[PDB]
Ligand binder design. Structure first.
Ligand SMILES: Nc1nc2c(ncn2[C@@H]2O[C@H](COP(=O)(O)OP(=O)(O)OP(=O)(O)O)[C@@H](O)[C@H]2O)c(=O)[nH]1
Ligand SMILES: Nc1nc2c(ncn2[C@@H]2O[C@H](COP(=O)(O)OP(=O)(O)OP(=O)(O)O)[C@@H](O)[C@H]2O)c(=O)[nH]1
Ligand SMILES: Nc1nc2c(ncn2[C@@H]2O[C@H](COP(=O)(O)OP(=O)(O)OP(=O)(O)O)[C@@H](O)[C@H]2O)c(=O)[nH]1
Ligand SMILES: Nc1nc2c(ncn2[C@@H]2O[C@H](COP(=O)(O)OP(=O)(O)OP(=O)(O)O)[C@@H](O)[C@H]2O)c(=O)[nH]1
Ligand SMILES: O=P(O)(O)OC[C@H]1O[C@H](OP(=O)(O)OP(=O)(O)O)[C@H](O)[C@@H]1O
Ligand SMILES: O=P(O)(O)OC[C@H]1O[C@H](OP(=O)(O)OP(=O)(O)O)[C@H](O)[C@@H]1O
Ligand SMILES: O=P(O)(O)OC[C@H]1O[C@H](OP(=O)(O)OP(=O)(O)O)[C@H](O)[C@@H]1O
Ligand SMILES: O=P(O)(O)OC[C@H]1O[C@H](OP(=O)(O)OP(=O)(O)O)[C@H](O)[C@@H]1O
Ligand SMILES: [Mg+2]
Ligand SMILES: [Mg+2]
Lengths: 215, 215, 215, 215
């Protein structure tokens, strides 16, 4: 399932992020912001049940309860996901948090075509309850999806109820590469960019979210 | 224009607010929360223009810019709007803030039928630019709309570009009373309750938002 | 008890507030900020008890518990206290909130000397438990103290355990006028300005906090 | 320079963190909280200059300006520092952010005495301006200081103006091991615990801040 959250509010922030004349304080702050907005979108897609409450004037009345806000396992993909996951926690307070690190298998002869043999050098995920939890992998940029797919490779094994992916900008290539392989995946993103260059950088993109937000 | 923002996320919070076993910290915090969510809805309805930005890799590209986030005049209707306006400011940072106080013309013989001759005892609004600003009157509860209409009576005179109304719960009666009189009004609300009793209290409602949030 | 919280961090923000080239977003945001900082100062003066907790490795160990964070009644003095009280709530989540409005008894012949016969036109305070609660009246500016003293006049009657006053800038005159009358009062403030002019405006002051923050 | 920020407000939160009956939402939230409080302490120790501003009524007047809030390089030591650094950013918005990962040189024969040959497997620090920046390394727990010293080993090389260390709980052993080696270091911490066991765990401590906050 593809969800392209391109409303005015989100395209407004996305524009600020794109703009290179946007300093670090603002670039970082916008990541957190979207995190909370896309965090809200995913919320309106989670499993909920109808409940009954009793108002003050004593009137038992129906209501909704997103019981699944109790089964959230967010997975922070360093280094740029951090700020994104910050805003995500504002929507999923009850989430356990996984941390993952991945590096392109250092080749030597610049090759990044469709695959840069990614490799995990850090992994710390809480227990994922099979067919119960809703895993949410966060990473602002999905370019060649080498990273994402490598992370998924491991998550899929846990067999959680649902698997969500939250990115700001993902590439034409990267979105199809993922969904074709894992069609049951709920992929949320704000914009889907046409192409990526021969270095794996997304175009038009927005530069390096990691350095833009940290350095 | 009526906008009933009844998505799962908003009906979820609304349910917590309804529930009388919800303490003050949480009841108040949920008002602020919705304020920011309904603040986001109104944002996706504001006038924006297409802009062009230059990414880092040097790619001039299109984007949206809600220029109207610059022309916002929020109007806080004491006493319960305060918390609501708190979250609203998180969506409209550039807004000037009006403060208003209204009291039912103290009669003596309990009468609240369709009108309780409301009266303004406090008023402090910034300058409202005719046909430029977008006025946003905030008040969680719209019951008989005596208060709202009394406030509008004064705002309409300013002749702003648009006029929005943000309420959590508004009554069948109160919504129609307002829109029939002022059809051009963008009325945002989460739920619209069937009826109000003979004291002007909304049913099923959620009790007194003012005392629930303050006392 | 006078507490002049003039540390670098607070004098830094106070300076920004003083500066007239500080827009509304920043001026307002700094009020909230100080609110939370002065909110922290008052916290280190509240009654607490020593407690014992059991760490994970199973080690019962001592700790402090500011039990009095449970007995807080904040009193928001319109119109400028609002933003200040916003940050104050971030330190005292468990506080009930009073709202008060006061106006100089509209004379005609500009007189503001030592007294401008203030008058309350709005009042909504929760129940204040005698000798239990710690009342905290918030108002960024204490000039002639006509407002403050008028508000206190009513609060003193409740006979709460303690009474705190949180202001950003208070005048030489206003501070002494209050403490001399009510010596048991814990008055917190960042700076105490030399004098106020013949209109009741503080000098050097920082202008109208109300219009600076709202309009 | 040792700074033990053991005020009631900080010992209050520290107590909640110690307490094993404190869930994840609250344990994590308290880390962020302290981050902002200890972030404020360090602020009152930074180099500032006296400035002059012009109030509204037109009165040039003195003020303080912590110019050094412009030269902050925070260094997040995974995995627990994340939440701590979250609150730290609320005090140092203008900071560049370094990320570091360290692992005990996997031996085989449980030995952790005074040194567990630590090893860095991840490092991404922005440029540190020699004798200009104020580096702030964040890590809630300083036990044997193997991690801290290993991180410092690299930071010292940059020769920044000042080097701060922000921890919640640090051990008798770890504090002296660091300051003896690097006496010019400004070490901030809330509590200093007596001893650590033979596994490197602090006593009384508060358990694993990483798993307490993430899993
Ligand atoms: N039990 C508990 N939950 C908290 C507390 N603080 C935050 N939370 C939860 O964490 C979520 C996000 O919290 P924060 O990081 O403080 O975010 P925020 O900017 O305050 O956002 P909102 O609280 O939604 O307005 C909230 O929606 C709450 O569900 C706390 O002190 N206690
Ligand atoms: N220029 C400026 N704008 C600010 C500052 N702090 C907040 N704002 C603006 O005010 C809005 C809401 O700010 P806050 O009350 O801090 O809300 P928040 O919980 O931090 O929410 P977000 O900043 O959106 O994540 C933001 O979206 C900003 O546009 C500040 O220090 N400087
Ligand atoms: N039980 C409960 N308490 C909350 C919640 N959100 C906030 N609080 C309390 O309210 C205080 C201030 O909350 P906020 O207005 O969200 O402030 P904040 O900017 O998030 O500040 P901190 O939570 O202290 O980091 C906190 O210190 C909490 O004690 C919530 O969802 N549940
Ligand atoms: N220019 C700019 N600075 C911002 C903005 N939002 C936050 N900041 C800065 O970042 C700091 C911490 O911001 P947040 O993470 O929003 O923290 P917060 O809970 O809102 O805390 P306070 O803003 O201090 O009340 C602030 O003190 C500001 O200096 C923004 O929209 N624009
Ligand atoms: O889809 P892919 O082509 O794999 O690219 C996406 C990933 O690459 C970048 O991380 P990087 O390794 O540059 O580290 P960073 O997190 O510090 O940016 C980016 O932050 C994503 O994590
Ligand atoms: O549509 P209406 O029938 O006019 O009712 C709605 C208004 O009444 C209540 O205010 P109240 O006067 O009770 O003061 P409060 O703000 O302290 O609740 C409520 O908070 C609204 O402001
Ligand atoms: O010590 P005093 O001389 O009485 O002055 C202090 C009070 O005066 C101002 O309120 P104002 O009536 O101007 O309304 P405002 O809250 O909108 O600023 C100020 O905001 C204080 O509330
Ligand atoms: O002073 P030391 O004895 O070196 O111990 C302190 C460090 O050890 C822990 O990290 P850990 O390696 O357990 O990973 P974590 O960050 O996930 O807790 C802790 O979070 C500190 O980072
Ligand atoms: Mg909060
Ligand atoms: Mg903010």
């Amino acid at each position: 399932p593809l969800y392209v959250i391109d409303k005015p509010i989100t395209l407004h922030i996305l524009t600020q992020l794109r703009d290179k004349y946007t300093d670090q304080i603002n670039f970082r702050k916008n990541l957190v912001r979207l995190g909370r907005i896309l965090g809200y979108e995913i919320s309106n897609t989670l499993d909920y049940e109808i409940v009954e409450v009793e108002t003050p004037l004593g009137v038992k009345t129906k209501g909704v309860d997103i019981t699944d806000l109790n089964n959230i396992v967010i997975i922070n993909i360093l280094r740029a996901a951090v700020p994104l996951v910050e805003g995500l926690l504002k929507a999923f307070p009850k989430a356990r948090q996984g941390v993952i690190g991945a590096s392109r298998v250092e080749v030597d002869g610049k090759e990044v075509p469709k695959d840069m043999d990614v490799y995990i050098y850090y992994k710390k995920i809480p227990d994922i309850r099979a067919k119960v939890d809703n895993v949410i992998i966060a990473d602002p940029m999905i370019a060649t999806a080498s990273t994402m797919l490598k992370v998924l490779e491991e998550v899929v094994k846990a067999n959680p109820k649902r698997i969500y992916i939250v990115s700001i900008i993902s590439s034409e290539y990267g979105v199809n590469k993922i969904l074709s392989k894992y069609p049951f995946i709920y992929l949320f993103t704000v914009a889907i960019d046409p192409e990526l260059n021969n270095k794996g950088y997304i175009l038009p993109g927005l530069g390096d979210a990691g350095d833009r937000a940290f350095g």
